[PDB]
Each structure stands twice: as C-alpha cells, then as structure tokens.
Structure 1
C-alpha cells in the first residue's frame, strides 16, 4: 500500500502540465528527503475523474524496472496527488531538440537500447503500452531515460488505425517510430501530412525515411518493426539484443 500522508510532501516549482493537471517537483520526507514529481488533478473532486487519474497509479505499482518511472505513492484525499520518481531533465522530445548538437550517436542509440529493456520487461509481464512515443519518455540524467506514461495516428501500427487492435506487435511498430524520433532529434513523424492520409501512405508500402547519420543496420531494424504483417515484426527481446550490438559497434 502506497497511501502517503500529505505533511510528508512539500510542493515545489511547476515542471510542466499533465493530462489531469499541473505536475510539480517537490520533496518527500520519509524515515532521507527524496526529490519527487507530484502529479495533481484539478477536477478530482468528481469520482469519475479520480478513478481515471488514480488508474495510472494502479498500473504503475505493478512495475519495477530501472527504465520505467517509479510510483512512490498516492494521496487519495482532495486535492488528489500521485507521487512519482523525479526525472530532472524532463521530457525526451524537448531534451533532444535542445541538445541536438550536444548529444552524439552513441547517446541516441543508448536511449533506444534503454527503452527496449523497459519494453522487453513490459512484454515479459504481457502488458501492452499502446502509446510508445518520444513524448512519453523522461530523462533522469544524460545517460538515463525512463518510460513514463501509464489519437496518435502517426505512431500507430496499421491494424491499430484500421481496427483498433493493440497487441505486443503494434507496440513494436510504435517503438520503431520512437527510435526514428530519437535519431531525428525529436522531430515528429509525418510532418505536414494529415492524419487521414497516413493509413493510405502505409498501405502503399511507404515508410519514414532513413534519418541523416543513422547507421544502415539500425534503420533496417526500424524497417523490421514496420512490417505490415504483425506476425513478421520482431519481439523486444530480439530488438534489445540487436540494439546492444549496434551500440557496441558505435562506442568503438
């Protein structure tokens, strides 16, 4: 059980806006004062909003992995708060844009690898994420990223677009797009394309182009993620191993 007394929490500065409300950084004093992220919920006075907001916490207590944001606890009395581990450097997408001439290829491949370990862990728990995108990834330090979110047509597998089918294979399709976003320094996929035109493009065998400076072996791995037939896509355990070798060939 994750119920925390509010007096053990000290609110700090706002670090961004979440789905249900402002996200703040703060301190959690337990019997060694830890820096935390505090998710708030402005409309949580109503049980329908509260149940949806707290479902994120219910989902997060199931996981314990170094590349998945940790649930510290919850404050169920109004105003309702979710206490999470703080990832100081913020959202990946913005971090990539800002540090576009700072981060080398080896660092970019490292983030993809780290995300593949988090996704292999989830796949081992038979958990389907449904929203793998660079915007749902958090940066803890310059060499440590975390998966942090528990209609994106341009990230979705064709079967998800056409039939609302979400499986472990559709999650592999989205990871391919996430890797592309990483190597493109946080540029959104299919820029200047309308959401309704994406399915038609994919159906014609069209894919996101090879990013400049992307190793061709890494791009062939992304194209394997983008097999139209879901049964032809690799699983995260294979991706993780591949990304390990690609990373070593880059570090040397």
Structure 2
C-alpha cells in the first residue's frame, strides 16, 4: 500500500465502468522517475465510508502480490478525495475482448504462452492460499507484449460442479475455471457452452458432457482441459503441473499436433 500524491497523476480517457466505479487511463510521474501509463480506479460518486474501507481493503490485498502475471498495484490515493487505486496499465485490455477483436491473428504457440502466464499467476495465488472464484478470460488483462495478468481482485459456466453444488471453493475449483479459460483462449473468445442455459450446463456436466476441442486446437491442449474438468477435484492437476505441462509443450512444439 504505497501512498501516491494525486499531483503526480494525470487522469486521461475513461476505459471502463467497473462495479465499484470508473477506470481511467492515466499517467504516473513520480519525482525523479520515468513516467509510466497506469489504470486509475475510482469509487462511484457518493461512496460511503464503508464502501471506501471495502475499496481500500481490496488495495491492501493486491499490494501483497508481486508476480509478473498478477496485476501490479502501483499505489493508492487516500490522503485526498476521491480515493483511487493505481495499477499498471494493460494496453490490450481484457483477454476475451482482445481475442474476439483479433480472431485467428495469434499462433498456437503464442496462445500457449498466454495460457502459461495465466497458469503461473494462478500458481502464485494458490501458493499464497487465495482462491480466485471468478477466473475467466474477462478477468485477465493483456499488456502490449501479450503478457497476460490475473486481475479481478455465481458465474455458473466457469464454476466447478462442487463449487456450484456444495459451495466448496478451492484452488482445485480455480483449476476447473482455468480449463474453461484455456478453451476461451484457444477458441479466440467463444462463449463456453454457447447458448446453453445455466441449468442446461449444470445438467450436461453432471452427465459427463465436456466442451469439445476448439477448431485447430492441439489434442494435447484439449486433453489438459479435460484433466482440469475431472469430476473429482483431487484428480485435477494443480497449477504447478499445468505450468510444467505447458512449458514442456512450448519446449517440445512437436507435441502441438
């Protein structure tokens, strides 16, 4: 939780209306340091002291994380009004819209690199005993160099069956969600289960339906999705094994067909 003087921040265009409030693209220029682009999150106008505390508690959590695939907190504005959370700027935005706007424009190995980065950030979060519960391509952000970073600090079709049926949220239910993300990425942002209703998805999953390989998806990558979607949460790979499998695919690209 580093305190940033608001005079070091210039707020430019709006780039989103999140749930707590608005997000802006801005510039951060600390004395003696090179200027960087940042995302500035604001709380909706008229926020209560309780909403303020809730907001700054989110910041406190983000500040604990220091990983290349986790959104970096630059600092907070709390001495002046309104409060703000300042994070690193991700030029390409949310991963799902980024893929939908660039359909077919990335190679398989670029896509696997993106998935590897996400798995590495998720490994770090799980190692620190945090369960995301909301892992989806819409909650991953992408910088100018295609590095993907986990953000967003019940979406039924992203959620593990035990998490829906028994509210048991663990890193193993995040792994289920990660398998759905893999499918979104390899499909360039298709909707999981398409137009199936939430209950249709639940019923299908209970009858051992699983999503098919996206077009031109390597068989080995779709198999790793299916491993993530094992009914028994203990049979799923942990994020450490996912990273190692994706590394081995990257290091052995013949594995990709």
| TM-score for both structures, normalised by structure 2 | 0.94
Q: Could you tell me whether the CA contact under 8 Å between 2:104 and 2:188 is conserved in 1?
A: no
**Residue 155 (str. 1) matches residue 164 (str. 2):** no
Secondary structure of the corresponding residue to residue 245 of structure 1? helix
The whole-number CA distance in structure 2 between the counterparts of 1:102 and 1:142 is 14
Q: CA deviation at 1:101?
A: 2.6
The whole-number CA distance in structure 2 between the counterparts of 1:147 and 1:34 is 20
Which of 92, 95, 100 is matched with 2:95 structurally?
A: 92
Match of residue 215 from structure 1 = 218
Q: Could you tell me whether the CA contact under 8 Å between 1:43 and 1:49 is conserved in 2?
A: no
**Residue 122 (str. 1) matches residue 130 (str. 2):** no
Match of residue 14 from structure 2 = 14
Secondary structure of the corresponding residue to residue 37 of structure 2? strand
C-alpha RMSD of the superposition: 1.5
Q: CA deviation at 1:55?
A: 2.5
Match of residue 30 from structure 2 = 30
Matches within 5 A, 1:169-180: 169-180=172-183
Distance 1:102 1:142, change over 3 A: farther
Q: CA deviation at 1:140?
A: 0.6
The whole-number CA distance in structure 1 between the counterparts of 2:108 and 2:46 is 43
Match of residue 49 from structure 1 = 51
Q: CA deviation at 1:248?
A: 2.8
Q: CA deviation at 1:44?
A: 5.5
The whole-number CA distance in structure 2 between the counterparts of 1:33 and 1:154 is 41
Q: CA deviation at 1:152?
A: 0.5
Residue deviations 1:143-174 (CA, integer Å, cap 9, x gap): 31111211210000001111111101101000
**Residue 79 (str. 1) matches residue 69 (str. 2):** no
Count of residues in Structure 1 that have an aligned counterpart in Structure 2: 252
Instruction: Give the unaligned 5+ runs of structure 2.
Output: none
Distance 1:28 1:208, change over 3 A: same
Which of 188, 200, 204 is matched with 1:201 structurally?
A: 204
Distance 1:44 1:51, change over 3 A: farther
Q: Could you tell me whether the CA contact under 8 Å between 1:73 and 1:84 is conserved in 2?
A: yes
Instruction: Give the unaligned 5+ runs of structure 1.
Output: none
Q: CA deviation at 1:57?
A: 0.8
Secondary structure of the corresponding residue to residue 149 of structure 2? strand
The whole-number CA distance in structure 2 between the counterparts of 1:161 and 1:170 is 10
